[PDB]
Amino acid sequence: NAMTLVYQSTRDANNTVTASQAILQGLATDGGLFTPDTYPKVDLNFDKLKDASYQEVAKLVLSAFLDDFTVEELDYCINNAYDSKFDTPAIAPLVKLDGQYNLELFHGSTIAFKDMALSILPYFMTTAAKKHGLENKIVILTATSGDTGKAAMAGFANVPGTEIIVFYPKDGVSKIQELQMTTQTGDNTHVIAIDGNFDDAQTNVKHMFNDVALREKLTTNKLQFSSANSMNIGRLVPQIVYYVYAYAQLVKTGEIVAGEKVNFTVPTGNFGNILAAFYAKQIGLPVGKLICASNDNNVLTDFFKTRVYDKKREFKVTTSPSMDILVSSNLERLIFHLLGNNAEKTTELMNALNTQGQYKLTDFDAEILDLFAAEYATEEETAAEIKRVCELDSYIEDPHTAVASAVYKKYQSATGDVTKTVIASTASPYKFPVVAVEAVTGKAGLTDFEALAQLHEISGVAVPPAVDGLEIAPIRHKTTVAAADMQAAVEAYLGL
Ligand SMILES: *Cc1c(COP(=O)(O)O)cnc(C)c1O
Numbered sequence: 001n002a003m004t005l006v007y008q009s010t011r012d013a014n015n016t017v018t019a020s021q022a023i024l025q026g027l028a029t030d031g032g033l034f035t036p037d038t039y040p041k042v043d044l045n046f047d048k049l050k051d052a053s054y055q056e057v058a059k060l061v062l063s064a065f066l067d068d069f070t071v072e073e074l075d076y077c078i079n080n081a082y083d084s085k086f087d088t089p090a091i092a093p094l095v096k097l098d099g100q101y102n103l104e105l106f107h108g109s110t111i112a113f114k115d116m117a118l119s120i121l122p123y124f125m126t127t128a129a130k131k132h133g134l135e136n137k138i139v140i141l142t143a144t145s146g147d148t149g150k151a152a153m154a155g156f157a158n159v160p161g162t163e164i165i166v167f168y169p170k171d172g173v174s175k176i177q178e179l180q181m182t183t184q185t186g187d188n189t190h191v192i193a194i195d196g197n198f199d200d201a202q203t204n205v206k207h208m209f210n211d212v213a214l215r216e217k218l219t220t221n222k223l224q225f226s227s228a229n230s231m232n233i234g235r236l237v238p239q240i241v242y243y244v245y246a247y248a249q250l251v252k253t254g255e256i257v258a259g260e261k262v263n264f265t266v267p268t269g270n271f272g273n274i275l276a277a278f279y280a281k282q283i284g285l286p287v288g289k290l291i292c293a294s295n296d297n298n299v300l301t302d303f304f305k306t307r308v309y310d311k312k313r314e315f316k317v318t319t320s321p322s323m324d325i326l327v328s329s330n331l332e333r334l335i336f337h338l339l340g341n342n343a344e345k346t347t348e349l350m351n352a353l354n355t356q357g358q359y360k361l362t363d364f365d366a367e368i369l370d371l372f373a374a375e376y377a378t379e380e381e382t383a384a385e386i387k388r389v390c391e392l393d394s395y396i397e398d399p400h401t402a403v404a405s406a407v408y409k410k411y412q413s414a415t416g417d418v419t420k421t422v423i424a425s426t427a428s429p430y431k432f433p434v435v436a437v438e439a440v441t442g443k444a445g446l447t448d449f450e451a452l453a454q455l456h457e458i459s460g461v462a463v464p465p466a467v468d469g470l471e472i473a474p475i476r477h478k479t480t481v482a483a484a485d486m487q488a489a490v491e492a493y494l495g496l
């Protein structure tokens with residue numbers, strides 16, 4: 001068959017593109033997300049996959065979803081992504097604990113799961129540009145206060161045919177977060193601290209992406225913008241791979257036989273990680289339940305329990321900051337599927353979220369919604385969970401992982417479900433060491449660097465390269481600009 005998988009915008013039934021086009025374009029001009037309109041046929045033979053390398057599972061899954069790329073293009077992307085940047089050749093090892101399995105997604109460059117897709121996105125982009133006969137360098141603009149900034153920089157660093165400029169809020173990040181970015185190496189990477197309202201920074205990036213005069217200047221200088229934000233399909237599809245890999249590891253170790261259903265509990269922010277597990281189920285992965293774990297910012301928990309998405313609520317900075325959200329960006333893709341892949345109806349709900357601050361899901365596919373469960377954990381519950389898993393399993397979870405393991409305990413209690421369950425472990429405790437060390441030791445008032453040293457003494461786990469010697473690493477980025485000067489600084493840097 002010569003058919004390719006059609007990606008459509010969730011807000012325009014006529015905006016259809018191939019996988020390579022969706023990745024290079026990133027954002028749909030209509031405001032929607034590029035989303036697969038059908039699910040590809042994938043032969044999940046665990047008799048073979050139980051012995052497959054991570055890269056072999058990636059080739060099977062990525063071939064199915066990114067089907068306008070050749071086998072040789074995908075091999076190039078997989079081999080360049082899943083290399084020595086990872087601190088174990090397993091890439092995403094599954095660890096067996098007393099009452100759960102933890103899928104460790106923190107073995108990449110920045111010890112956080114966003115490395116899984118950001119290690120490969122740059123190669124998808126440069127390969128897509130060449131496939132479309134473009135001779136332009138791709139310029140990524142990223143405005144974020146989360147771990148995405150460091151993961152994006154580390155993924156694009158020294159990738160030929162790419163340049164990345166990351167904007168972060170000055171005094172809006174921890175000292176350990178700031179140093180991770182300002183010590184980042186790579187001549188094609190630049191990090192700029194923004195003085196002022198950081199909402200303006202995000203607005204200014206969108207303005208630049210839609211600026212027709214600026215686009216003409218980039219074209220003339222053999223440049224083009226792309227986006228590596230939460231809604232790029234190239235950041236979601238590589239996440240499908242590790243759900244299939246986790247299942248393969250359960251079969252390989254004799255924990256399950258192929259065909260048995262497993263559950264996945266996912267610490268959720270913008271929803272792409274748990275949506276990737278949903279896409280894994282759609283291509284045949286035996287999934288019993290997808291458990292959406294939230295922190296005190298529980299708009300998603302309220303949505304799954306009432307079908308009302310209401311963003312008019314207090315916002316809290318928590319100990320699981322990557323999940324501090326009001327608008328879960330990728331939930332829109334699930335809304336689209338819940339409505340039978342209907343862009344008009346999806347647009348209506350998204351327009352209601354913007355004008356009314358809320359929407360209610362009605363006339364949806366119950367088979368899809370019934371796959372999801374949801375609970376949230378408080379900050380105290382997060383700390384109590386890091387302490388309990390340390391006591392029971394001699395294993396230290398980061399706070400995001402602990403929100404998920406605490407939510408799994410709540411899910412088990414409320415439903416009595418005994419299905420084997422995998423926790424998606426989204427960061428190393430070395431990335432958020434203060435809450436982890438204080439939770440297991442009872443200590444208080446530790447600095448980030450004091451907690452790093454104590455975590456090594458307590459766990460016996462080697463300090464990952466991302467935070468090893470970070471206190472004395474050379475500062476390569478020392479730029480702070482006002483939000484209103486971002487575009488002039490970008491134009492001057494690009495020689496426009
Ligand atoms: C980004 C992030 C999350 C949330 O992931 P989504 O796919 O956006 O739901 C959770 N934990 C950590 C550590 C993260 O960096």
Ligand SMILES: [Cl-]
Pocket residue numbers: 190192479493
């Ligand atoms: Cl610069």
Ligand code: NA
Pocket residue numbers: 080158159
């Ligand atoms: Na590389």
Ligand code: NA
Pocket residue numbers: 256260
């Ligand atoms: Na069993």
Ligand code: NA
Pocket residue numbers: 041042043044283284285
């Ligand atoms: Na299948």
